[PDB]
């Protein structure tokens, strides 16, 4: 990383001097949480796809500056912030269980909007 | 159709309970709002206004409606307690400037066209 | 060009938004009811009320969704539909800059769960709806009246509520204070009869029955 | 001055006196509030707030539902103040 960047530019979060292992551990944790999620759910498929892709690129390229470039998520700090948010989302809707069919249909004409 | 979602109360008994300590708070409030707001209202004629307003919505029987009146009275209680309300709004319940309105059909006929 | 007055049509954004609409419909089939993208490239998601917290969180948190900005929160009262009130959440993305809209329905009494946690900006917006449409929000941190005057009544934006309200206020020397009086206009609002009896847009014609 | 059942007797009657609606003559020990004493739904609650201020305590709600006759009032204050003379 050479000279560690002083500030990411956003005052809501600081610099992670060792970002690669953070990406690794958070990605592995969320992959575990998706392993919890049943196979048939489309959420597990999509999120496992994007996360295993992200883990592949982060473990492939070890330069942080190129890591942001091919990660298209700005500075690595907001990337691990978004990874924490994704972990949180998967955990929170583990028991929300949205993979089930719709709870019930809307009542009669509840969406037509010429009145 | 008949099945519906509650707000807080399950049955008439528990909403009947909520209006109970709402009247509790109004009772314990009236004297020191008379004192604090420099009301021209008297203590007894303060309490009976609360009683008459509580009796005004005597016809209500749907539970959810009762939760709605109780939470609106709760907002009224907060507005009064921490002096967000003003003396004029407190008087607003007492109809001073409002002239007495006749009730009999004969007076209605004498005044003007109105049912 | 040939169409200098007609607005430009951007079909690429339309197809891409439709793809994301199918995405979000597949991800949360529990609450989503009907997703569609308008002609002017604005997507709307019609969800069941119980999905106010989940769907928003999925839109606030998911890596491939990435929406953290509550542009506004609004209710649109329409007395015709069985649940008259409909609540619109407007979200804007930063990493994937775009505007998404999720719409739910509720009647006067059936409460709709308060977002607040998903978007802490909703709070004041939330209060407005309760103070302006009667839509109570479950476990909202402080659902006190926000906009209207003190000790008010009703919810003015309800289409049944009259334009002029019910009661004005003015000085009274007999009681030496501002007092509230039943409405008595000095000149009544003339309600003009616009909307000519000839059909405007054949495309949006209501089917017969 | 030790707490007594008779003290609570007389204090309950004296503080029931102040309530405007109740007529003292038909007020008795077993005068039922709903029917005999004739108070409405809210007036039963009304003298509930007349109780704990005068004796100097707090009244919960699940009892205030039950506390209707002055006998119930006096013996509930009795076991709450552990009154046994
Ligand atoms: C002084 C100026 C400021 C203050 C201005 C006066 C107060 C303003 C705020 C409160 C106004 C609100 O309309 C009343 C409310 O709080 S709630 C609904 C009352 N109506 C019912 O709940 C159903 C009918 N009533 C019954 O069923 C029972 O009679 C009753 C419940 C009363 C007691 O039953 P119990 O005893 O079993």
Cα–ligand 1 centroid distance for B53 (angstroms): 7
- How large is the angle between the packed helices D41-55 and D5-17, nearest 10 degrees? 130
Q: Terminal CA-to-CA distance of chain D, rounded, Å? A: 11
CB C126 within 8 A of CB C115: yes
CB C83 within 8 A of CB C106: yes
Question: How many Å lie between the alpha carbon of C128 and the closest alpha carbon of chain B?
Answer: 14
B17 interaction partners in chain D (CB closer than 8 Å): 61, 65
* Tokens (6 digits) for B59: 């016809």
- CB contact C120 to A (< 8 Å): no
* Tokens (6 digits) for D32: 């039922």
- CB contact B27 to D (< 8 Å): yes
> Please, do chains A and D touch (3+ CB pairs < 8 Å)?
no
Cβ atoms < 10 Å from Cβ of B28: 12
Cβ distance A107 to C83 less than 8 Å, yes or no, reads yes
Show Cβ contacts of residue D42 under 8 Å, excluding neighbours closer than 6 positions: B23, B51, B54, B55
Give all chains having 3 or more CB-to-CB distances under 8 Å with chain C. A, B
Tell me which residue in B7, B65, B86 faces C150 most closely, judged by beta carbons.
B86
Give all chains having 3 or more CB-to-CB distances under 8 Å with chain B. C, D
CA dihedral A96, A97, A100, A104 (to 10 degrees): 0
- Give the three-class secondary structure for A21: helix
Q: Which position among D10, D36, D40, D53 bears the catalytic label? A: D40
Cβ distance B54 to D42 less than 8 Å, yes or no, reads yes
- How large is the angle between the packed helices A76-94 and A19-36, nearest 10 degrees? 20
Instruction: Collect contacts of C141-147 with beta carbons under 8 A, ≥24 apart.
Output: C141/C114, C141/C116, C143/B71, C143/B75, C143/C114, C144/B75, C144/B78, C144/B79, C145/B75, C145/B79
Counting from 1 in the atom list of ligand 1, the atom nearest the Cα of B41 is 1
Say how far apart CA A53 and CA A73 lie, in whole Å. 14
- b/e map D22-46, b = 16+ CB within 10 Å: beeeeeeeebebeeebebeeebbbb
* Tokens (6 digits) for D79: 């076991």
CB B31 within 8 A of CB B42: no
> Which residues is C113 bridged to in the sheet?
C138
Angle at D66 between CA D61 and CA D68, to 5 degrees: 115
In C4-158, alpha helices (H) = 11-27, 52-61, 122-133
Cβ distance B79 to C177 less than 8 Å, yes or no, reads no
CA nearest to D34, candidates D68, D7, D11, D85 = D68
Question: How many Å lie between the alpha carbon of B84 and the closest alpha carbon of chain C?
Answer: 8
- How large is the angle between the packed helices D41-55 and B12-36, nearest 10 degrees? 50
* Tokens (6 digits) for A31: 């992959």
For ligand 1, atom 29: residue with the closest CA: D41
B108 by Cβ neighbours in 10 Å (0-12 / 13-18 / 19+) ranks as middle
Cβ atoms < 10 Å from Cβ of C178: 16
Instruction: Count the alpha carbons within 13 Å of D6 in the hemisphere toward its beta carbon.
Output: 3
Q: Which residue in chain C is spatially nearest to B4 when comparing CA positions?
A: C110
- CB contact C195 to A (< 8 Å): no
Phi, psi of C43 (to 5 degrees): -95, 140
Cβ atoms < 10 Å from Cβ of D9: 16
B61 by Cβ neighbours in 10 Å (0-12 / 13-18 / 19+) ranks as exposed
CB B22 within 8 A of CB B80: no
CB A49 within 8 A of CB A42: no
One-character DSSP codes across D29-52: SS--TTTTS---HHHHHHHHHHHH
CA nearest to B26, candidates B59, B72, B73, B65 = B73
Say how far apart CA C21 and CA C15 lie, in whole Å. 10
Cα–ligand 1 centroid distance for D32 (angstroms): 23
- How large is the angle between the packed helices C52-61 and A76-94, nearest 10 degrees? 150
Angle at C101 between CA C98 and CA C105, to 5 degrees: 175
Say how far apart CA B56 and CA D60 lie, in whole Å. 26
Cβ distance D49 to B24 less than 8 Å, yes or no, reads yes
CB A67 within 8 A of CB A19: yes
**DSSP letter (8 states) at residue C4:** S
A5 by Cβ neighbours in 10 Å (0-12 / 13-18 / 19+) ranks as middle
Show Cβ contacts of residue B77 under 8 Å, excluding neighbours closer than 6 positions: B22, B25, B26, B29
> Which residues is C47 bridged to in the sheet?
C32
Show Cβ contacts of residue B19 under 8 Å, excluding neighbours closer than 6 positions: B54, B66, B69, B70
Element (H, E) at C33: strand C32-37
Give residue limits of the domains in chain B: 1-115
């Amino acid at each position: 990383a050479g000279l560690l960047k002083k500030t990411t530019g956003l005052v809501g979060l600081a610099v992670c001097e060792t970002p690669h292992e953070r990406l690794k551990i958070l990605y592995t944790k969320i992959l575990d949480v998706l392993g919890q999620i049943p196979k048939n759910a489309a959420y597990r498929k999509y999120t496992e796809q994007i996360t295993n892709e992200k883990l592949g690129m982060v473990k492939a390229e070890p330069d942080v500056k190129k890591l942001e470039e091919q990660l298209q998520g700005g500075q690595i700090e907001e990337v691990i912030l978004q990874a924490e948010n994704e972990l949180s989302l998967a955990r929170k809707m583990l028991r929300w269980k949205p993979w089930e069919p719709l709870v019930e249909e809307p009542p009669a004409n509840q969406w037509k909007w010429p009145i | 159709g008949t099945s519906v979602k509650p707000i807080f109360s399950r049955d008439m008994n528990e909403a009947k309970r909520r209006v109970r300590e709402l009247y509790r708070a109004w009772y314990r409030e009236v004297p020191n709002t008379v004192h604090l707001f420099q009301l021209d209202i008297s203590v007894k004629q303060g309490r009976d206004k609360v009683r008459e307003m509580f009796m005004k919505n005597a016809h209500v029987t749907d539970p959810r409606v009762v939760d709605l009146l109780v939470i609106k009275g709760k907002m009224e209680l907060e507005e009064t307690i921490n002096v967000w309300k003003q003396r004029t709004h407190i008087m607003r319940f007492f109809h001073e400037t409002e002239a007495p309105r006749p009730t009999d059909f004969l007076s209605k006929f004498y005044v003007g066209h109105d049912p | 060009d040939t169409r200098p007055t007609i607005r430009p049509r951007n079909d690429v954004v339309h197809k891409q938004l439709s793809a994301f609409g199918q995405y979000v419909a597949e991800i949360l089939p529990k609450y989503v009811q009907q997703v569609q993208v308008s002609c002017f490239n604005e997507l709307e998601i019609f969800i069941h009320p119980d999905g106010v917290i989940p769907v928003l969180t999925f839109l606030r948190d998911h890596t491939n969704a990435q929406f953290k900005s509550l542009a506004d929160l609004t209710a649109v009262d329409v007395p015709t539909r069985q649940n008259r009130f409909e609540i619109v959440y407007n979200l804007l993305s930063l990493r994937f800059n775009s505007q998404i809209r999720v719409k739910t329905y509720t009647d006067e009494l059936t409460p709709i769960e308060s977002s607040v946690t998903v978007y802490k900006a909703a709070n004041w917006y939330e209060r407005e709806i309760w103070d302006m449409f009667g839509v109570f929000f479950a476990n909202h941190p402080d659902l006190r009246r926000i906009l209207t005057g003190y000790g008010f009544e009703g919810h003015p934006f309800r289409k049944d509520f009259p334009l002029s309200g019910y009661v004005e206020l003015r000085y009274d020397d007999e009681v030496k204070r501002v007092v509230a009086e039943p409405v008595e206009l000095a000149q009544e609002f003339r309600k003009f009869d616009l909307n000519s009896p000839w059909e405007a847009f054949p495309a949006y014609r209501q089917p017969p029955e | 001055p030790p707490l007594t059942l008779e003290a609570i007797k007389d204090r309950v009657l004296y503080v029931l006196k102040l309530y405007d609606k109740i007529d003292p003559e038909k007020l008795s020990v077993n005068s039922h509030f709903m029917k005999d004493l004739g108070l409405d739904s809210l007036d039963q609650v009304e003298i509930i707030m007349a109780m704990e201020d005068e004796f100097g305590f707090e009244i919960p709600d699940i009892d205030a539902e039950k506390l209707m006759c002055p006998q119930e009032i006096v013996d509930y204050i009795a076991d709450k103040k552990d009154v046994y003379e």
